[PDB]
């Protein structure tokens, strides 16, 4: 059986309702596409700071 | 800038098909709900193997 | 040889002798069940706010 | 809620066996150490292959 | 397309410049030794406490 | 203590010898950097398959 775990790391500073919906339409996203059992699917929002991160070697701060 | 990078590991089974769906509906999913320009996200897909994750103690999903 | 890696997601607040007690006991049943040389055997925890995880697309702080 | 999620990568070559047992015990060192509920605690291992990780630049363990 | 994504967890505390130079310089060596073009490369930095990781079941906070 | 972990995703494709060299390499960037003791850096290459990842919603890099 499929226990989908998603992580997903983005940008700090996201509402606390931004975070809701984001986890609830990343989980009907995997159900819909996957066919996984809804209560099988676990979401992690992880936040990053600008200057943790970059593309191309240059951090989002810089 | 947002950058949003989302990590789905989900169970070795699902379509090439299944898995281009996947991306492009959890790509979805957080330009909706949090705005993130589309071209900055990313989705890498992990396959679990049978026998190689588990929930309670034992081999199997919720 | 081994190295395993092992990463921990859970619920913030734990205190330090549950942190430390973790990481021991994480690290012995490792070792135990795979062989591993203990020196090899590596532990990170991650502790996430209840607004930031869920399952079934609901969130632990809903 | 506690929802533990716990990633173990280590390297390619333990039977299903020993990842059973590498389930069940770690899962029980969670749910000691920290006093999760048993039926919330995940457990993913991941397997590294060889020639695919190191420790000190070399391509070797600890 | 390759789509290099780096994750680099260690001890908090470093430097804005540190931090910056880490990002360009593990973009440099990934590029270099793969042949990744520069833009697909993203580096993600995670800073640990030290009571939240160890070695050897032993945390370095302790 | 640093105990740098990096954990690079990146298209299944590259030799070993690229490996061995961006395990190097990586080690070099991290030491350069940071400071961290050397053998207290750890590099994990996880190879991601194609049709398995995208950007922008379509399965291409950046
Ligand atoms: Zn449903
Ligand atoms: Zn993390
Ligand atoms: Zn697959
Ligand atoms: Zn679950
Ligand atoms: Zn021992
Ligand atoms: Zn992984
Ligand atoms: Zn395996
Ligand atoms: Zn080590
Ligand atoms: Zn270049
Ligand atoms: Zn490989
Ligand atoms: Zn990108």
Same mark, same amino acid.
């Given at each position: 059986?499929?226990? *989908? %775990? &998603? #992580?997903?790391? @983005? @940008? +700090? =500073?996201?509402?606390? +309702?931004?975070?809701? #919906?984001?986890?609830? /339409? &990343?989980?009907?996203? &995997? /159900? !819909?596409?996957? =066919?996984?059992?809804?209560?099988? %699917? $676990? &979401?992690?929002? +992880? +936040?990053? !700071? *600008? #200057? $943790?991160? =970059?593309?191309? =070697?240059?951090? !989002?701060?810089?």
């Amino acid at each position: 059986s499929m226990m *989908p %775990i &998603v #992580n997903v790391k @983005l @940008l +700090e =500073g996201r509402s606390d +309702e931004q975070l809701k #919906n984001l986890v609830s /339409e &990343v989980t009907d996203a &995997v /159900e !819909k596409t996957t =066919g996984a059992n809804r209560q099988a %699917i $676990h &979401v992690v929002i +992880e +936040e990053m !700071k *600008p #200057n $943790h991160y =970059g593309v191309a =070697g240059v951090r !989002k701060s810089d």
